[PDB]
């Protein structure tokens, strides 16, 4: 129930939920000893990663996935894929002949960790490049801001 939704058991690897034979009830207070890491580059591993009970292998905090190479920013426009979003990076491409620019938008598919609750669309998001973890997806969400306009 709750976490174990799929047909297989869904555990974090790299922690052994078993060793126990002492008083004061079955298991501890926190019960499951949650593994997480920090991702570096001065990115704060969030509360809901460390505190939260979910699991996801592709989550950069609580999963096997290393951030490296490029770090880009975009803005979230679709949230209908599960544990993933489409973010629309915009940019001004220069033509030289006409000393002018043209708008151009690449909309990248991007893995969104469930440590991030309360992510709306139109949300300025930062994504780290990672190893390719889907056909299209290479980029994990690292931090979210949302503050451009509508409310805290």
């Amino acid at each position: 129930a709750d976490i174990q939704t799929e047909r297989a058991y869904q555990k974090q690897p790299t922690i052994f939920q078993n060793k126990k034979r002492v008083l004061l009830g079955e298991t501890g207070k926190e019960k499951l000893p949650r593994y997480y890491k920090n991702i570096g580059l001065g990115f704060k591993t969030p509360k809901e990663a460390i505190e939260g009970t979910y699991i996801d292998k592709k989550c950069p905090f609580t999963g096997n996935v290393s951030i490296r190479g490029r770090i880009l920013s975009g803005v979230v426009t679709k949230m209908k894929m599960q544990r993933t979003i489409v973010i629309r990076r915009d940019y001004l491409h220069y033509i030289r002949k006409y000393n002018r620019f043209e708008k151009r938008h690449k909309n990248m598919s991007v893995h969104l960790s469930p440590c991030f609750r309360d992510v709306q669309i139109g949300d300025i998001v930062t994504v780290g490049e990672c190893r390719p973890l889907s056909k299209t997806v290479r980029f994990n969400v690292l931090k979210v801001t949302k503050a451009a306009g509508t409310k805290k």
Partner: protein, 206 residues
Amino acid sequence: GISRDNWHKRRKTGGKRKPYHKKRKYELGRPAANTKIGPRRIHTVRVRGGNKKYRALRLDVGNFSWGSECCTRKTRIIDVVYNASNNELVRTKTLVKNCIVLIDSTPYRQWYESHYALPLGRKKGAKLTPEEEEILNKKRSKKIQKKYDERKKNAKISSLLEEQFQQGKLLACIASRPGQCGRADGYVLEGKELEFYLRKIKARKG
């Protein structure tokens, strides 16, 4: 032959890619092992850079660990019981990674009888009278009895496991990838996991 490679399928947008070359011997697959239970039949396979891949086709034993207790005798793979991916694989009896086999409890039982100096798997008086007394019978006293009393409320095994031992098999998960390595090494289900898979199997039976 049987190629893994992105070139042959559509782009994110939906449009068809055009094949800018022919198949290559590295953008490559191979036909699957789908190893069964049975007496040991493994084939070697040369792969990239030379090297070897040891494709199991049949497989009788496996090196399963009791996690908590930390013993890990090598054991007969008695039967495949459940497999999360696909049900036809279970029906076939096909070991893959994360297959939930059963394994012959015997060696773990034997280790537990040696180490913790208690019986496991309840019985009237056939195992208890001749062998267990001989395993005990303390001609030394003092040291060994103090050690096995230090092995205190500590023996206290899980209820699910104990039942499984008294029956005489153990639900166990495969961790190796038979068709690449050749072994069927894994771990014994315990605690929350065990509770989950027993619940899955009961639901399957109806």
